[PDB]
Amino acid sequence: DLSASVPTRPAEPERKTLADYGGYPSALDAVKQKNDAAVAAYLENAGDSAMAENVRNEWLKSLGARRQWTLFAQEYAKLEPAGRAQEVECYADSSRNDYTRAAELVKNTGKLPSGCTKLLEQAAASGLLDGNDAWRRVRGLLAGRQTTDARNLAAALGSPFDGGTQGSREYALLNVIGKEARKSPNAAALLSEMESGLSLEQRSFAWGVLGHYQSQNLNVPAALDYYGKVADRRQLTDDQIEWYARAALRARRWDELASVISHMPEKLQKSPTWLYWLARSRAATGNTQEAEKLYKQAAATGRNFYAVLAGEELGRKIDTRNNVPDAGKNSVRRMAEDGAVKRALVLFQNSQSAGDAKMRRQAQAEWRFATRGFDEDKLLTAAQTAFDHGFYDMAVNSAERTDRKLNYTLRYISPFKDTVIRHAQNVNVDPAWVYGLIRQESRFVIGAQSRVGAQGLMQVMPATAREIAGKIGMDAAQLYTADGNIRMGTWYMADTKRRLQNNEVLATAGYNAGPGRARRWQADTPLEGAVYAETIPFSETRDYVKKVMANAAYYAALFGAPHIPLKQRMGIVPAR
């Protein structure tokens, strides 16, 4: 059974929730303007809400930057630990001279928030950083055009860019590793010329930069040539080493792929991607028992693309039967009486009645806050509460967070079938694929709005909507209605597929990145579908294709069509 236990946190009247939200944007503005009196006034009588936690976190980032440490400590003491932002934790630890977090943070080679960047610089100046990892971060920052942060870290390590020692040599290597320099036709030749005066670590990193650029440009032979010159693979950034594995994968070099994976950080080796591809490599080289153990580990990672593919290699098909009962209706009712859940529902319902998209986003924040500590039984109860109230994205949000107790009807909701199925049939596209795309694009939020203006259930861009509308006799503003949005998106899936050799993997990539890019990523030989997907150069599109296709496999199982293994759905991507 599922437990009927629900939280009973103090509830506030709807009027109080709305009054606090009325002041929420101004409180965030008061943080930006450094009006500490106004922020304190907003928080003084605030409920224990995501609104208060969000304002407090943003305030603490500003107080740390301004070194107002007495006010910082007072307010940090009011945050729950699970609610403290990463940069706030870094400022707090720095204020106590506690550099425990540095050992892990320094392994990041990209931009970090200011508080965490400064924590690492302080640890460096006190000799509290692993030197190998610290210089790897300097190099990573140089390659990512974060020159100021790289310069400040090298200075804190005692070897500044103008000191004639290690720092100055690392900085000079920009003639090879710079953003534009790495693209030069002469980059590899220039690195080969200066190599003799570079350390083992500098040489390994620099060939990783050149190999990474070629691999992401899908020049696989050149990528493997350059990456083959990396003598110490642990010097590579995470992105560099993954792009080495991707090149070996695309070339079907199973031995080299297995070797590269073995040099990755443990966190990367244990990802679904590299558990699955290492298993495929062991299978390809005749190591059946090693492959099976790795497939089992990949399948244990849950409801994702590679876990499903791994299960299929083990003879396991997707099974969408729930392994738990429905939540009891009294528990679903009483869950809505919990003060934090109620606050989220108040903001959600008022966002609908008042047409306030910003309020809806804060309602999502209240939901995540309210459900943050929940066990699996409470998550599944809350998922049904959210679904009943029409808060569809939060129903998925809670249901997908479980590990052992699985409710697939709440993980893979299918509202709007009286519209989606018909539109999909009308252009002859698989409705399970359409649902999988909607789930990834919008999580079923009808008025979803991306940072770049993608709109609606299917996240069509306005420029694309105008093109579509001109082809199929619609008005561009129908993008902003649910039925017109589904019509536009399903038609665009079918048109993009038609333009990409009628291939569904290409079509999924082309929907997100444009058909010109999907076609650029093809090879001159056919590619296994999962190999095309994993070697997509754009990180957002790469993740997108795998999630859409995994989603589609789950929907197909719930919809009862004849079974299509995910490996078959991925199929073979044609040669250009």
The sign of the dihedral angle between the CA atoms of 272, 210, 224, 140 is: negative
Question: 460: which strand partners?
Answer: 455
Q: What is the DSSP string of 39-60?
A: HHHHHHT--SSHHHHHHHHHHH
**Nearest residue to 200 (alpha-carbon basis) of 154, 170, 231, 164:** 231
Question: How far lies 434's CA from each of 279, 309, 367, 543, 552, in Å?
Answer: 30, 20, 27, 17, 8
Which one-letter DSSP state was computed for residue 233? G
| Contact (Cβ atoms closer than 8 angstroms) between residue 166 and residue 172 | no
**Which residue reads 């980032």 in tokens?**
61
Resolution in A: 1.4
**Nearest residue to 30 (alpha-carbon basis) of 41, 20, 19:** 41
Separation CA 491–CA 473 (nearest Å):
12
Which one-letter DSSP state was computed for residue 358? H
Backbone angles phi, psi at 573, to 5 degrees: -85, 125
Instruction: Please report, for the chain, how many H helices and E strands are present, in that order.
Output: 35, 2
Separation CA 404–CA 406 (nearest Å):
6
**Nearest residue to 46 (alpha-carbon basis) of 74, 78, 77, 71:** 78
Q: What is the DSSP string of 309-336?
A: HHHHHTTPPP----SSPPPPHHHHHHHT
| Token representation of residue 354 | 């008042």
453-456: list long-range contacts, CB under 8 Å, 24+ apart: 455/479, 455/480, 455/485, 456/480, 456/482, 456/485, 456/489
SS3 270: coil
| Token representation of residue 428 | 């002859």
Separation CA 4–CA 441 (nearest Å):
33
Separation CA 6–CA 382 (nearest Å):
9
The sign of the dihedral angle between the CA atoms of 450, 456, 462, 464 is: positive
171-174: list long-range contacts, CB under 8 Å, 24+ apart: 171/142, 173/139, 173/142, 173/198, 173/202, 173/206, 174/142
Separation CA 84–CA 74 (nearest Å):
14
SS3 560: coil
Which one-letter DSSP state was computed for residue 355? T
**Nearest residue to 39 (alpha-carbon basis) of 67, 51, 49, 368:** 51
Separation CA 433–CA 554 (nearest Å):
10
| Contact (Cβ atoms closer than 8 angstroms) between residue 265 and residue 236 | no
Which residues have C-beta within 8 Å of that of residue 511, sequence separation ≥ 6?
437, 492, 493, 496
Instruction: Residue 19: count other Cβ atoms within 10 Å of its Cβ.
Output: 15
Rg (CA), the chain: 26
Backbone angles phi, psi at 572, to 5 degrees: -125, 125
Separation CA 43–CA 57 (nearest Å):
12
**Nearest residue to 36 (alpha-carbon basis) of 64, 71, 84:** 71
Is domain 417-573 annotated with CATH 1.10.530.10?
Answer: yes
Q: What is the DSSP string of 372-390?
A: TT--HHHHHHHHHHHHHTT
SS3 460: strand
